[PDB]
Amino acid sequence: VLDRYIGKTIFTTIMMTLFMLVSLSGIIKFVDQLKKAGQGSYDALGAGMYTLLSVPKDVQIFFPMAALLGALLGLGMLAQRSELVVMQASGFTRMQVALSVMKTAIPLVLLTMAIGEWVAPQGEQMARNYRAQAMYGGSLLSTQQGLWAKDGNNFVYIERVKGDEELGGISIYAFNENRRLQSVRYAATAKFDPEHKVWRLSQVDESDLTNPKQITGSQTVNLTPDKLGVVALDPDALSISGLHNYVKYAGRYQLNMWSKIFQPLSVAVMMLMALSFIFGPLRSVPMGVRVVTGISFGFVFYVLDQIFGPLTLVYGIPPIIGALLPSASFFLISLWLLMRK
Amino acid sequence: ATLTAKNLAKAYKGRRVVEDVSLTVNSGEIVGLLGPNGAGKTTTFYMVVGIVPRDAGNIIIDDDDISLLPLHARARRGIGYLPQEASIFRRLSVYDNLMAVLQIRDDLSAEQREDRANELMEEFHIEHLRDSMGQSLSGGERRRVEIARALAANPKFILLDEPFAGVDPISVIDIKRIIEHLRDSGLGVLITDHNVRETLAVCERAYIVSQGHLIAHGTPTEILQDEHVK
Amino acid sequence: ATLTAKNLAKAYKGRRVVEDVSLTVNSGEIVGLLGPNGAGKTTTFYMVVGIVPRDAGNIIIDDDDISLLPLHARARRGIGYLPQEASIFRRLSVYDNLMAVLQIRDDLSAEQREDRANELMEEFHIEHLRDSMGQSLSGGERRRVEIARALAANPKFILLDEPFAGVDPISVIDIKRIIEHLRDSGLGVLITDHNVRETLAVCERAYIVSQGHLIAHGTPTEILQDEHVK
Amino acid sequence: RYLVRETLKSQLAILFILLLIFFCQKLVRILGAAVDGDIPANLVLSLLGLGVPEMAQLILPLSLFLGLLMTLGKLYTESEITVMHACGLSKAVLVKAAMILAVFTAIVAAVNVMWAGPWSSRHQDEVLAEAKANPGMAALAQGQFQQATNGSSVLFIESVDGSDFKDVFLAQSVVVADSGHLTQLQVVTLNQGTRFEGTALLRDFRITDFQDYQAIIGHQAVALDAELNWRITLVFTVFMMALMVVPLSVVNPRQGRVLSMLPAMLLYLLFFLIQTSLKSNGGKGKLDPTLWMWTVNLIYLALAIVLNLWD
Ligand SMILES: CCCCCCCCCCCCCC(=O)O[C@H](CCCCCCCCCCC)CC(=O)O[C@@H]1[C@@H](NC(=O)C[C@@H](CCCCCCCCCCC)OC(=O)CCCCCCCCCCC)[C@H](OC[C@H]2O[C@H](OP(=O)(O)O)[C@H](NC(=O)C[C@H](O)CCCCCCCCCCC)[C@@H](OC(=O)C[C@H](O)CCCCCCCCCCC)[C@@H]2O)O[C@H](CO[C@]2(C(=O)O)C[C@@H](O[C@]3(C(=O)O)C[C@@H](O)[C@@H](O)[C@@H]([C@H](O)CO)O3)[C@@H](O[C@H]3O[C@H]([C@@H](O)CO)[C@@H](OP(=O)(O)O)[C@H](O[C@H]4O[C@H]([C@@H](O)CO[C@H]5O[C@H]([C@@H](O)CO)[C@@H](O)[C@H](O)[C@@H]5O)[C@@H](OP(=O)(O)O)[C@H](O)[C@@H]4O)[C@@H]3O)[C@@H]([C@H](O)CO)O2)[C@H]1OP(=O)(O)O
């Protein structure tokens, strides 16, 4: 079948332009962090970090733009070489061609949906984690910062954070709905322990307010664990159940929850937009105009994505709207170029 | 079997580039379509092919108006097409090209596709190049593969675009013999060239578009009588 | 007043295309250069032009080894060249094109440039197209403008690459009349083409390459009667 | 008599469509400060035009690079550079034209740092800082950490839109508020409050009751609580890339037109890449501890000259 032909052609053009857009941004961010590696090594803020850091680019940063450019050049080959009109003059339908591209689009959605929750989150975790030589970096290793927690009615100021998951730490503002203080603690020994100790009872330095005069104090010796206490990673951190964290209480975190799970729709709509191009205003203008239109609508996708995500401030528009807006309203321009004539 | 055009029309910003072409082609004959360059041939032939849509007129196969139907629909109803430039699939085999066009034939079976492919390859002299790559072939071998691929769809009016361009007179007479082989097959052929005295000698009748008008129509000698072009 | 190519040779990474070919072009005669499809019509002509670099070869105008020059140094020393396609400065006027060629005429005055421009515009009949926009010319007008630019640099041996490829047989005869007017102005004109039956009818003598080898040359009668042509 | 007005048109076009690309980059960047960096977005449209010259530092050399390359691509694929070669004109005539363009755009990049570069730099040095101090309608609830020059005073409100407050929380230890409202000019009209400052048990245990206190903690916290390389090297880019791109705008028949742009772009951005990497130690002017940059400047000038010439 030539189903194999169109599928393997589009797939290898995807993989070639994907390796190209990985290598370019890889060496650019390599020489970008080469402007701060005066404390790391020759490769520590370099090659040992980017051999892991190539794949979060590969998930979502370039993979829609590389999706359009691959499924555009690899299907513009078939119009440059007067070869799509051959099968289209043998009777192989344009919907046959659309099904032939999207029959192998399924490994691309499968690929990025796999990597964006198996390899890329832990990839950028280990990337920021390996940058602990040159300091000031916020990672799973945080630094000496007072992380203002917010556990519902409870609140905790942090004094000091170490790298062994220990805390001269927890200062519970034990506040009820009467705003009656119950503890003024200083958890000097907050050592990491298993799931029975998501808050470990350390270093009692409290005072309850059962009376304005009588105070039951004790100088002897909340629901945010360490895998939820790492919150400075505002780009793509982890899976949906852990991202479902600020829930009994934050708009950008569920915005990123939708942006994690709409990248498959981005790739699929992106190939559909490429085929509406190759059956649209294209098919007559040459390969320079093919690749110019490619990078143009890819950059249009980038600017609409990275504005209309963070644009959710004025009305505080729903995040489904804010995340589908560079995808559904790109499906729309594709659909109009389909049914235009 | 009979393909017929009636009152063909195309314009651009109101400037008429095609004004009332009505061409016919029967099965067995080789209709030529000549003229000046860019004043009827490209646009009229490509409307009859179906690369470009019409504005006013009829395209009829055997009392069935296909003018709304696009190019792949005209191929599913019986009109074949061969492009000007090199139109082979540069990664499959010749064997896989012929089977790849035999895939969409919804009237065949497993042994029938192999049989029809071996028929076409043994008839068009590529069966020794069965396991070759079309990217790495020569011009005449590649034209054999393209004509065999066109015959794999089993057409009834193949509409050739420039077969007599860019080759020496030896390959001109070889492609002349393959068009003679197609008129032996009972398949109609519509052809547009700019080799007038190298194409008009095979056509049993030819139509001469001239800035829109078919000012000459009929046999090649009757075309050479009038010089309303010249 | 005499151009001669001696022992031309060219390859493409061990793919030989020209193997010890020498051609002679006297002044004032339409010399052809023909052959088979892509075995030396293109390559030998582009070496005598100088676009491709040779390896071994001798190009001579009056004992001058001009084989090591760039392209425009050959154009500086009396050789013309016309490309295959639309080499018009589409956003200049025609008189600006002619004077733009005439800016490097150091052997003339500051007013004999305009005098020669008036002569060429009276000759090639562009007196109404003197100030037209260079995009908006037709086929024969465009050919006359490009030939006027060629002659404004005042060559001796002009080298045309397919001056017939893509014109109907009216403009073919007109271009033959233009080339006879060129050789009646005393220029040794060299022509390659894919049209042997169009080229051989105007050339006074022609050269037939074949696979990096001239296998025949001279008179068109002997070129009709030599080793294989039909 | 030159093609300079033909390449100047695409110069203007590529200029006009690179300024919007870099607008859409710096705007996406400063939306990061409007959302996460906690800076109020009453200054986006002002910050764009007050900072367009540090943007146009890098537009104009790449603008001439593209406006030569994309133009001579058409000039070569119409087989028209090779008809200037078919007449007595040389490669030097379009070299003369390209260097006239280099003079023009180098005047542009010079008057940039003459009258609008540092001007916009020292009016962007303020972020309209006197209105960063003077408050408006900017609250930004669930935030406002601002460790520097405030102690650790955080004051967020677990509310919906600003009518029923929960845990205004007013840090400094902390004073805790139950009810609240809002007025502008630092005077917030909150109803109740309860001050607390006890760190240890041996210290004081200070309470105040619900009072008519107005909670003025919003105070205007000010921070008081090489060009020697670029001025010559960017003018050298503009003066060099025009001479560098003409031997690379040579569009070959087989490899197509846009692949006839890959080596020019791959050398241009490798240039700016190595220049920016060699801007690692800069010392801000009078502290310049390395001059490996004129190594790559001289060797790309040599690459341009070697490229051009072919004897
Ligand atoms: C075909 C036609 C061609 C088309 C045209 C071409 C288009 C080109 C586009 C370019 C436009 C923009 C130009 C540009 O970009 O321009 C420059 C670029 C030059 C080249 C561009 C032109 C190319 C050539 C021309 C083209 C030729 C072809 C770079 C720049 O600008 O340089 C720098 C910049 N690099 C880039 O931008 C790369 C560039 C790269 C550009 C690439 C171009 C590619 C083109 C490809 C062509 C293809 C053909 C080949 O662009 C990007 O990528 C952006 C994306 C661009 C993509 C656009 C789309 C492309 C489409 C193309 C087709 C259409 C970099 O950070 C950007 C990263 O952000 C994200 O990553 P993250 O998310 O962050 O990870 C991006 N992620 C992303 O985008 C997302 C994705 O990945 C990418 C997606 C992209 C789109 C994807 C799809 C594309 C479409 C595809 C379609 C097919 C990354 O992406 C990356 O990684 C790279 C990425 O993979 C690659 C990009 C991918 C592109 C792919 C394209 C493919 C196309 C193919 C088809 C065509 C990106 O790298 O750092 C700076 C900015 O950060 C600043 C700021 O200024 O804002 C400064 C900060 O300080 C930092 C620093 O970061 O440097 C951090 C510090 O922590 C620390 O580390 C410090 C030092 O290190 C310390 O040692 O440094 C800090 O400041 C202040 O903060 C605090 C303040 O608040 C006070 O409290 C202070 O304290 P603190 O709190 O502690 O910090 C600080 O003080 C510190 O320091 C003090 C001392 O040092 C004193 O010194 C003083 O003075 C100094 C000054 O003198 C210096 O001048 C300064 O140091 C200070 O002022 C300082 O005060 C100490 O004092 P002491 O105590 O010691 O006394 C003090 O204690 C403390 O330590 C300081 O004061 C802060 C802010 O100010 C806060 O207020 O942030 C920049 O410097 P600057 O801007 O110049 O300033």
Is residue B35 annotated as involved in ligand binding? yes
Instruction: Write down the number of H helices and E strands in chain C.
Output: 8, 10
Residues of D in contact with A306 (CB under 8 A): 28, 31
**Domain stops at, among D175, D201, D219:** D219
**Cα D249 to Cα A119: distance, rounded to the nearest angstrom:** 43
* D21 CB within 6 A, ligand 1: yes
The answer to whether the Cβ–Cβ distance between A146 and D176 falls below 8 Å is no
Structure token digits, residue C14: 């061990």
**Residue D225: DSSP 8-state:** -
User: Between B81, B86, B99, which is nearest A89 by CB?
Assistant: B81
**Cα A52 to Cα A119: distance, rounded to the nearest angstrom:** 9
| Amino acid, single-letter form, for residue A13 | T
Shortest Cα distance from C44 to chain D (angstroms)?
A: 17
Q: How many beta-carbon pairs below 8 A join chains B and C?
A: 28
Neighbours of A176 (CB within 10 A): 11
Q: Is the Cα torsion angle A60, A65, A69, A72 positive or negative in sign?
A: positive
Q: For residue A68, what are the contacts with CB-CB under 8 A and spacing of at least 6?
A: A270, A271, A273, A274, A294, A297, A298, A301
Q: Nearest residue CA, atom 86 of ligand 1? A: A302
Backbone angles phi, psi at B125, to 5 degrees: 65, 55
**Cα A190 to Cα A156: distance, rounded to the nearest angstrom:** 13
> C112-123 vs C94-101: helix axis angle to the nearest 10?
130
Backbone angles phi, psi at D89, to 5 degrees: -70, 155
The answer to whether A114 touches A121, Cβ cutoff 8 Å, is no
The answer to whether the Cβ–Cβ distance between C197 and B194 falls below 8 Å is no
Residues D41 and D89 occupy one common structural domain:
yes
Distance (Å) from CA A313 to ligand 1 centroid: 25
Structure token digits, residue A259: 């942006």
Q: Which residue has the tokens 């086929």?
A: C139
Beta bridge partners of B192: B161
* D146 CB within 6 A, ligand 1: no
With H, G, I as helix, E, B as strand and everything else as coil, classify residue A34.
coil
User: Between D147, D171, D256, which is nearest A287 by CB?
Assistant: D256
The answer to whether C192 touches C43, Cβ cutoff 8 Å, is no
Interior/surface letters C56-81, b for 16+ CB within 10 angstroms, e for the rest:
ebebebeeeebbebebbebbbebbbb
Q: Does A216 touch chain D (CB under 8 A)?
A: no
With H, G, I as helix, E, B as strand and everything else as coil, classify residue D34.
helix
- Listed resolution, Å: 4.0
Beta bridge partners of C190: C31, C159
With H, G, I as helix, E, B as strand and everything else as coil, classify residue B122.
helix
Structure token digits, residue D122: 């020292």
Residues of D in contact with A215 (CB under 8 A): 205
Rounded alpha-carbon distances, angstroms, from residue B66 to A85, B17, B58, D126: 18, 22, 8, 71
* A34 CB within 6 A, ligand 1: no
Known binding-site positions of C for ATP: 35-42
The answer to whether the Cβ–Cβ distance between D28 and A303 falls below 8 Å is yes
The answer to whether the Cβ–Cβ distance between C230 and B166 falls below 8 Å is no
Rounded alpha-carbon distances, angstroms, from residue A86 to A11, A287, B92, C160: 21, 19, 14, 35
**Cα B141 to Cα B28: distance, rounded to the nearest angstrom:** 25
Q: Is the Cα torsion angle A79, A82, A86, A89 positive or negative in sign?
A: positive
| CA-based nearest residue to C151, from D22, B123, D87, A284 | D87
Of all residues in chain D, the one with the smallest CA distance to A232 is D36
Supply the range of the domain harboring residue D17. 4-130+224-308
* Sequential DSSP letters for C33-86: -B-STTTTHHHHHHHHHTSS--SS-EEEESS-BGGGS-HHHHHHTTB--B-SS-
Backbone angles phi, psi at C112, to 5 degrees: -70, -20
Structure token digits, residue C97: 């094109």
The answer to whether the Cβ–Cβ distance between B37 and C168 falls below 8 Å is yes
Q: How many beta-carbon pairs below 8 A join chains A and D?
A: 75
Neighbours of B53 (CB within 10 A): 13
* Sequential DSSP letters for D136-177: -S---SS-----TTSTT-------SSSSS-S----B--EEE-
Q: Nearest residue CA, atom 175 of ligand 1? A: D284
| CA-based nearest residue to A300, from A322, A325, A321, A317 | A325
Q: Are strands B30-34 and B188-192 parallel, antiparallel or unpaired?
A: parallel
| Amino acid, single-letter form, for residue D174 | V
Q: Is the Cα torsion angle A297, A299, A302, A306 positive or negative in sign?
A: negative
The answer to whether A186 touches A158, Cβ cutoff 8 Å, is no
Alpha-helix runs per DSSP H in chain C: 41-49, 71-76, 94-101, 112-123, 139-152, 169-183, 196-199, 220-225
Q: Does C129 touch chain B (CB under 8 A)?
A: no
Provide the experimental method for this PDB entry.
cryo-EM
Q: Is the Cα torsion angle C148, C152, C155, C156 positive or negative in sign?
A: positive
The answer to whether the Cβ–Cβ distance between B169 and C229 falls below 8 Å is yes
Residues of C in contact with B139 (CB under 8 A): 37
* A288 CB within 6 A, ligand 1: no
Structure token digits, residue D204: 């004081």
Strand order in the sheet with C159-161: C30-32, C189-192, C159-161
Burial class (CB in 10 A: 0-12, 13-18, 19+), A136: exposed
Of all residues in chain C, the one with the smallest CA distance to B169 is C230
Q: Does A215 touch chain D (CB under 8 A)?
A: yes
**A3, containing H or E segment:** helix A3-33
The answer to whether the Cβ–Cβ distance between B83 and A86 falls below 8 Å is yes
**Cα C41 to Cα C212: distance, rounded to the nearest angstrom:** 9
**Cα A24 to Cα A32: distance, rounded to the nearest angstrom:** 12
Backbone angles phi, psi at A149, to 5 degrees: -75, 165
Distance of CA D64 to the CA centre of its chain: 20
Q: For residue A319, what are the contacts with CB-CB under 8 A and spacing of at least 6?
A: A251, A254, A255, A257, A258, A312
Instruction: Show the CA angle centred on residue D145, arms to residues D217 and A159, nearest 5°.
Output: 105
Residues of D in contact with C100 (CB under 8 A): 1
Backbone angles phi, psi at B213, to 5 degrees: -95, 145
**Cα A124 to Cα A119: distance, rounded to the nearest angstrom:** 9
**Cα B132 to Cα B102: distance, rounded to the nearest angstrom:** 18
The answer to whether C195 touches C164, Cβ cutoff 8 Å, is yes
| CA-based nearest residue to B35, from B157, B221, B199 | B199
Shortest Cα distance from C115 to chain B (angstroms)?
A: 36
Burial class (CB in 10 A: 0-12, 13-18, 19+), D137: exposed
Residues D118 and D87 occupy one common structural domain:
yes
The answer to whether A246 touches A306, Cβ cutoff 8 Å, is no
**Domain stops at, among D219, D239, D266:** D219
* A136 CB within 6 A, ligand 1: yes
Q: Nearest residue CA, atom 96 of ligand 1? A: A29
**Cα A105 to Cα A107: distance, rounded to the nearest angstrom:** 6
The domain defined by C1-230 carries CATH number 3.40.50.1100: no
| CA-based nearest residue to C47, from C35, C34, C56 | C56
**Residue C214: DSSP 8-state:** E
Distance (Å) from CA D31 to ligand 1 centroid: 14
Number of separate domains in chain D: 2
Residues of A in contact with B104 (CB under 8 A): 90-92, 96
The answer to whether the Cβ–Cβ distance between B171 and C37 falls below 8 Å is yes
Instruction: Write down the number of H helices and E strands in chain A.
Output: 13, 6
**Cα D236 to Cα C32: distance, rounded to the nearest angstrom:** 51
* Residues listed for chain A: 341
Q: Is the Cα torsion angle A150, A154, A157, A162 positive or negative in sign?
A: negative
User: Between A35, A181, A299, which is nearest D21 by CB?
Assistant: A299
**Cα D311 to Cα D308: distance, rounded to the nearest angstrom:** 10
Alpha-helix runs per DSSP H in chain A: 3-33, 47-56, 63-80, 84-87, 94-102, 106-118, 120-129, 240-243, 252-261, 263-278, 287-308, 319-324, 328-338
* A25 CB within 6 A, ligand 1: yes
Q: For residue B24, what are the contacts with CB-CB under 8 A and spacing of at least 6?
A: B2, B3, B4, B5, B31
**Cα D296 to Cα D301: distance, rounded to the nearest angstrom:** 8
* A65 CB within 6 A, ligand 1: yes
User: Between D6, D80, D87, which is nearest C104 by CB?
Assistant: D87
| CA-based nearest residue to A307, from A260, A255, A245 | A255
| CA-based nearest residue to A306, from A60, A110, A12, A56 | A60
Residue ranges per domain, chain B? 1-230
**Cα C143 to Cα A296: distance, rounded to the nearest angstrom:** 38
Ligand 1: which of D62, D126, D238, D260 to mutate, judged by most atoms within 8 Å of the beta carbon?
D62
| Amino acid, single-letter form, for residue A91 | G
The answer to whether the Cβ–Cβ distance between B37 and C167 falls below 8 Å is yes
**Cα A211 to Cα D267: distance, rounded to the nearest angstrom:** 77
Q: Nearest residue CA, atom 97 of ligand 1? A: A29
Of all residues in chain D, the one with the smallest CA distance to A158 is D152
